[PDB]
Each structure stands twice: as C-alpha cells, then as structure tokens.
A and B are shown apart, each in its own frame.
Chain A
Amino acid sequence: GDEQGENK
C-alpha cells in the first residue's frame, strides 16, 4: 500500500 519500493 505504502511501504517498500527501493529505500534502504
């Protein structure tokens, strides 16, 4: 929904 996409 809105958690991970690339961010480390």
Chain B
Amino acid sequence: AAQTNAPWGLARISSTSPGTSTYYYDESAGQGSCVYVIDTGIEASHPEFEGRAQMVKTYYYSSRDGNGHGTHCAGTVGSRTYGVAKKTQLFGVKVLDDNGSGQYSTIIAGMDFVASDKNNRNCPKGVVASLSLGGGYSSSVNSAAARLQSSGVMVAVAAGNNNADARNYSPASEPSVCTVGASDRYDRRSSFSNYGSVLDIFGPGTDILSTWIGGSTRSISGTSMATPHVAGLAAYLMTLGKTTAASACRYIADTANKGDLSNIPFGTVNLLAYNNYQA
C-alpha cells in the first residue's frame, strides 16, 4: 500500500532517503496487535481512530484527554492518516493530568497495570507500550519499565528533550527498553533531543502532524513524537511476524538506516527507524 502526501515522518520511515512524500507499507498494517499509550489519555471518539481506540484506565477524576499530548502520540501510532500501524488496536492509560504532569508512583502504577491488563485482551500478534514521558533519574521508574518489558510487552520510551545525555533521565536510562531519540526532516538530530549510549534508535520528532483533541489536528515537536513512530513500527513488524516483543527493538536497530543522521555526538548510535518495505 502507498499513502501519497503523507506526513514527512511516515514517508521517512519507509524510505532510505529524506525528502519523499509517500508512505509505503504492508496492508496488514498492525492488525491483530495492540499498543497501550501511557500518557494524558486518548480522545477515542476522534474519527481518525475509526473506533479502534479505547480508554482502559485512568488515575484522575476523568478518563478524558484534556491536554492533547496523548491523542497526538496515539495518532502517530495508528490513526488512519497520521499513523504508522493503521489497523492496530489502541488502549489509553491516563497517568498524566491535563497539564501534562504526573507523579512517579502513578506512572509506575500505570506500567504495572499494562503488564497485567494485556492478559485480558485479545492481541494475537503482540503487545506494545508507548511511553512519551520522563523525568529525572529514578531507579524505581526504571525498574517498572524493565518489569513491563520482561512481562512480554515491547516498551518504547522517549529519550527526553534536554539536549543532554539520557543517562540522567527515567525511564529513558533503563537499558532493557527501547529508548527513542528524535530527528528532523533534513536527517539532523532534533536540536532538543537527548543522546548518549543508552539510546537505541532515532525516529521522526520535529514538526510532526497528528490528531489533537476536539477532533482536530496539529503539528508539534519532541522525542514524545519520535517514540510512537517506533512503537507503531514495532506493532507493524510483529503483525508481519518478523520479530517478537522481546527482540523488536534489536530488530529495528539491525534493519535501520545507518549513518544517515547529522549532529550525532560520538558514542551515540546513528540509526534511523526503517520498515524495509518492498512491493
């Protein structure tokens, strides 16, 4: 399948060169897989989700996404127009409030919830968790992310937006999960993106168009936008039977576009998420 005039990020992950506008993908499109978006929630009613989205857990008075951040990331995972895996099932877990904030104990609870909840769901092709959040280093936050990954969920997490070494941030610094840096449309590391040896892979993160609350759309920037690209790609590749949850991150690095990115500090991987699609 081909999506013409696609968002730049989608075109990029189906190409070996920047500057193209068509997203090429297999028509299976993540069907039979599930992605939990652990964030501010998801506006499940947005027409772009086609009824494939649902809220399963909230830690606040409402399950409603009153921010937009969660809806944006879920959109990049698997909305019709802006999504990598256009037929995946989306599950919303609201651990962040409508200001984009949450405490560590809640985020940990949300991760443990997903580890258990996936056992109640029909996800024959596998389970992915997308974590577009983080803060200062915490061993117990890192531990919860390791547990979720261990439980058989492919965990992808934002490197963070501090133009610093991601080793001082959590869950980004947990070696066992898939830590995602951001790139822009000219194959440069995003100016805000964290880096370092703990990074596994880069994804499109600058100027990413996706779903927003109120049934709208907008373009925003962040390693938060890069993460759902990788999480969506994992779901896609698991549906195609090319990899499993335990090995998806490694498989994504092995088959990545290598050496194409600029402004990568020495000691950071030069690897860009790539679907390796051939009609």
17 pairs from A and B in contact (CB 8 Å cutoff):
A1-B107, A1-B133, A1-B136, A1-B141, A1-B170, A2-B135, A3-B134, A3-B135, A3-B158, A3-B161, A3-B169, A4-B133, A4-B222, A4-B224, A5-B101, A6-B99, A8-B221
B104 at the interface (CB under 8 A from A): yes
Separation of A3 and B211 alpha carbons in the complex (Å): 21
Is A4 a contact partner of B138 (Cβ separation < 8 A)? Answer: no
Chain A proximity of B226: nearest CB distance (Å): 13
Extra 6 A-B pairs, beta carbons < 8 Å, given A1-B133, A4-B133: A1-B134, A1-B141, A1-B170, A3-B160, A4-B224, A5-B100
Question: Whose C-beta in chain A lies nearest to the C-beta of B108?
Answer: A1
Separation of A4 and B224 alpha carbons in the complex (Å): 9
Question: Nearest 8 CB-CB pairs, A to B?
Answer: A1-B135, A5-B100, A2-B135, A3-B134, A1-B104, A3-B135, A5-B99, A4-B100
| Chain B residues in 8 Å Cβ range of A2 | 101, 135-136
Separation of A2 and B137 alpha carbons in the complex (Å): 10
The total of chain A residues at the interface (CB under 8 A) is: 7
| Interface size band for B | 20 to 34
Is B104 a contact partner of A6 (Cβ separation < 8 A)? Answer: no
Separation of A5 and B39 alpha carbons in the complex (Å): 11
Interface string of B179-222 (1 = CB under 8 A from A): 00000000000000000000000000000000000000000011
B278 at the interface (CB under 8 A from A): no
Chain A proximity of B227: nearest CB distance (Å): 12
Q: Which interface residue of A1, A2, A4, A6 has the most chain B CB atoms within 10 A?
A: A1
Separation of A2 and B134 alpha carbons in the complex (Å): 6
Separation of A5 and B224 alpha carbons in the complex (Å): 11
B87 at the interface (CB under 8 A from A): no
Chain A proximity of B7: nearest CB distance (Å): 20
Partner of A1 from the list B99, B103, B161, B224 (CB cut-off 8 Å) is B103
Question: Whose C-beta in chain B lies nearest to the C-beta of A6?
Answer: B100
B69 at the interface (CB under 8 A from A): yes
Chain A proximity of B91: nearest CB distance (Å): 21
Separation of A5 and B271 alpha carbons in the complex (Å): 28
| Chain B residues in 8 Å Cβ range of A5 | 99-101
Chain B proximity of A8: nearest CB distance (Å): 8
Is A1 a contact partner of B69 (Cβ separation < 8 A)? Answer: no
| Chain B residues in 8 Å Cβ range of A4 | 69, 100, 133, 161, 222, 224
B175 at the interface (CB under 8 A from A): no
| Chain B residues in 8 Å Cβ range of A3 | 133-135, 158, 160-162, 169
Interface string of B92-103 (1 = CB under 8 A from A): 000000011111
Separation of A2 and B161 alpha carbons in the complex (Å): 11
Interface residues of B in 149-180 (CB under 8 A from A): 158, 160-162, 169-170
